[PDB]
From Swiss-Prot, chains B, E, F, G, H, I, J, K, L, M:
This is ATP synthase subunit c. The chain crosses the membrane at residues 1-20, 47-67. The record marks 55 as: Reversibly protonated during proton transport. It comes from Bacillus sp. (strain PS3). It is found in: Cell membrane. F(1)F(0) ATP synthase produces ATP from ADP in the presence of a proton or sodium gradient. F-type ATPases consist of two structural domains, F(1) containing the extramembraneous catalytic core and F(0) containing the membrane proton channel, linked together by a central stalk and a peripheral stalk. During catalysis, ATP synthesis in the catalytic domain of F(1) is coupled via a rotary mechanism of the central stalk subunits to proton translocation. Key component of the F(0) channel; it plays a direct role in translocation across the membrane. A homomeric c-ring of 10 subunits forms the central stalk rotor element with the F(1) delta and epsilon subunits.
Length: 50, 71, 203, 64, 71, 71, 71, 71, 71, 71, 71, 71, 71
């Protein structure tokens, strides 16, 4: 078997671990910002109708 | 033997010229859409025809680079 | 790392990568579009965000009435090129044969036929200097995506071999984060320049 | 910073905002607190002042 | 023997051209967002669009340099 | 036997000069249409004749490179 | 033989491109923070993003210089 | 022997210099007719005598390239 | 043989890039301190980190020239 | 022999320097008579003496290229 | 044999980089003291620390060109 | 031997440097006459002594080119 | 045998860098003259010490070129 496969796959896994410690906080906050941003507009429309 | 280096200087100088030309055009259209942001399509179409020019002469250079390579 | 073709006509491994990227794009699309919800959450808000992102790009290039048709071509094009660039990074396996399952966009023929398919579509919905500019922009779009993925593929592979043969984790880590950055930027510039030529030929 | 839209008739707004931005006759422009001493004529267009999330618009005519 | 420095001048002139074009674009983007902060998302968007356009034609010189090293 | 290197430096330097010249002309003309839009057709025609000049000298450079590689 | 010269001119042209691009973007961000001093963190963060995106291609030039040195 | 790339470096450097100078002249004449449009014939006549004045020396460089190639 | 020429062309191109880039940065920061002289420490810290980048890529260029001279 | 390469190089760099210098002087006099057209003859005459001054030394290089081609 | 030409290209490229850098720095400080005349000592102290700061790497390139001439 | 192309490349780089420097200084004299046309004597006398300064080192280079051609 | 080429390119690169640096500093010091007349002595003193700075390295270059030609 070749040696490069498990070597670069192991470092791809540890790169995803570093990107997990570094990167789950920005993009989940971007998705939460988008999710919170749709709801306010919807509620305002409902309030005017009421 | 020297046709490899010929193709190489041809693609290198074409890349340098296209990089500087595209950099100038897109730089000044950044400041154009920063001064007056409602002029984005009329800046954008002229940007892309300038990109077409400044690439299209190095593109025929890099097309000629392969016949430089073969000889 | 030779071109492994089981059939003389066409590359077998490229067809395998096209099939696996079509199935993974289709299953993430049907996982984001499971049911109808008026309050978006989970992954349906992500699919709607990509949908309105493509729409925004269309609105930048052309009038909304003319370019409204292109939205469902554009969103599958950006997601298809997105996953097609990010497939080459995790595994990139080497078998005892020539080569198997690198990525589709690293093949030059795949990217050039996808670019000429794009330009065939924008000729279908739509004097020597104009046609040489047309062939110029076709081949520079195909060569753009092909080169900017294939150089990173070779570099990542080189890094993988340098690590395995004999301490070098963080250079390929920085390069691989930069390579998923290159993948998403190349997908976005590919679909944006697609919509630019679509807007240039429609209106 | 203190922003004060001033007419030859009399003062208009004359309060304090966060970040005022207006379009000049050259183009767009924004003013952050601590800006350089800057002078630019205005076009016939509104002036946004961005009081938090309010963004009270003030339409200047002539303008400077 | 000669193809090695052929590939080297090709990737070097590509790096030079992409560095100058990227410098012009990015410098004008950051002075444009220094002029006003209200348009920094659209200026970062067109910034990355410009960086792709000026880093595109030097990287075809890079992969053609690998082709030159192949022959 | 150095005619391939000859023609290739000729095409490369012509591409570099045409790239920088076209970049300057197109960048200043999109700044010209950006500071005022209402005479974009007046600007474009003088831009295209300037592009015609700054490429028409490297076009005869490319044709002379063809007769260089022929010899 | 020629591999060390290849490696050296590759890393040298990468250094030239990165130096010109970084000089442009850093110079425009310090005149930007001299123009409006309350915009300093946004300007320097976009400046470091620009440092990365102008030193993208010289850094790959460096490792390809190591490839050229190895051959 | 080497007269062909002598002829070619002459044509290439003349084309590069003509491209940069002609791009500067045409770019300043279109920003001049952009910021005040009423002087288009005056600015075009002095632009054309300026570009003839620039490319006077690369054209005699091209005929010197002819007598270098004949050597 | 070629290793000393390699080391010296690497140091020379790194010096030229560092010279132009640091000249741009230092020149724009002294004109920025000429505009608003109360911003001396901010301009000095930002020019020092920018110069640190523009120098530090030719710094590794210089140590790579040392290992080129060793080979 | 190699004196042909010598003369061509002198001719080429003289043309490049004269092209950039003449482009700068003519382009800035386009801007100068574009902003204040009532001054046009006196600044175009000192532009012409600046033209002769910027291309004095490349003509000397042309004469020395005749000397080098003779050698 | 090539060590003398190595030291020559090293000192020459360091001289060109130091020339452009010091030209930028002294040029912008001379327009800076042309703008605000009472800021002359602060501008001169920052100018001289900039001149030493940009000729730091060319002078070590010179003192490495000496051992390039030796080796 | 190759002292003829040594002398010629000295002439060429001196011509390029003198052309760029003379073009910059006489162009901005035109720009200064356009800003204020009543200080033409002091602007032209500082112009001509600056022309002497920029021209001095290439003339020293070309007389050393004469001493280089002989050797 | 190549010491003559070495000395000649050292003098040429020093002349080109000195020409660009002196062109920049003389050009916008006469801009500073043209904006206001009364600061002519302080502008000229900073001008000539800038001439000393941008010419010093060049002077060292030509002295070391004579050392290289002696080698």
């Amino acid at each position: 078997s070749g040696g490069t496969i498990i070597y670069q796959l192991l470092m791809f896994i540890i790169l995803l671990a570093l990107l997990r410690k570094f990167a789950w906080q920005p993009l989940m906050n971007i998705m939460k910002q988008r999710e919170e941003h749709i709801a306010n507009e919807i509620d305002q429309a409902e309030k005017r109708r009421q | 033997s020297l046709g490899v280096l010929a193709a190489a200087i041809a693609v290198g100088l074409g890349a340098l010229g296209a990089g500087i030309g595209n950099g100038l055009i897109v730089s000044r259209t950044i400041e154009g859409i920063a001064r007056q942001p409602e002029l984005r399509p009329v800046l954008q179409t002229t940007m892309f025809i300038g990109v077409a020019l400044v690439e299209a002469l190095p593109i025929i250079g890099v097309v000629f680079s392969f016949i430089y390579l073969g000889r | 790392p030779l071109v492994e073709f089981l059939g003389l006509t066409f590359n077998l491994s490229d067809m395998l990568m096209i099939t696996i990227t079509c199935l993974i794009v289709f299953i993430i699309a049907v996982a984001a579009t499971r049911s109808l919800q008026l309050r978006p959450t989970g992954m349906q808000n992500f699919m709607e965000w990509v949908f309105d992102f493509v729409r925004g790009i269309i609105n930048s290039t052309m009038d909304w009435q003319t370019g409204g048709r292109f939205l469902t071509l554009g969103v599958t094009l950006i997601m298809y090129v997105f996953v097609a660039n990010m497939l080459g990074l995790p595994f990139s396996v080497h078998v005892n044969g020539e080569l198997w399952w690198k990525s589709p966009t690293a093949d030059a023929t795949v990217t050039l036929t996808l670019a000429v398919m794009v330009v065939a579509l924008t000729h279908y919905y739509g004097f020597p200097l104009k046609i040489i500019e047309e062939f110029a922009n076709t081949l520079t779009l195909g060569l753009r995506l092909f080169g900017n993925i294939y150089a990173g593929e070779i570099l990542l592979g080189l890094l993988a071999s340098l690590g395995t043969h004999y301490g070098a984790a963080i250079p390929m880590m920085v390069w691989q984060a930069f390579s998923i950055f290159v993948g998403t930027i190349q997908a976005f510039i590919f679909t944006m320049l697609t919509m630019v030529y679509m807007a240039h030929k429609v209106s | 910073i203190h922003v004060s839209v001033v007419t030859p008739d009399g003062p208009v707004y004359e309060d304090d905002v966060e970040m005022v931005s207006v379009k000049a006759k050259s183009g767009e422009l924004g003013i952050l607190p601590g800006h350089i001493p800057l002078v630019a004529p205005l076009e016939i267009s509104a002036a946004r002042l961005k009081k938090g999330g309010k963004t009270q618009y003030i339409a200047v005519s002539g303008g400077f």
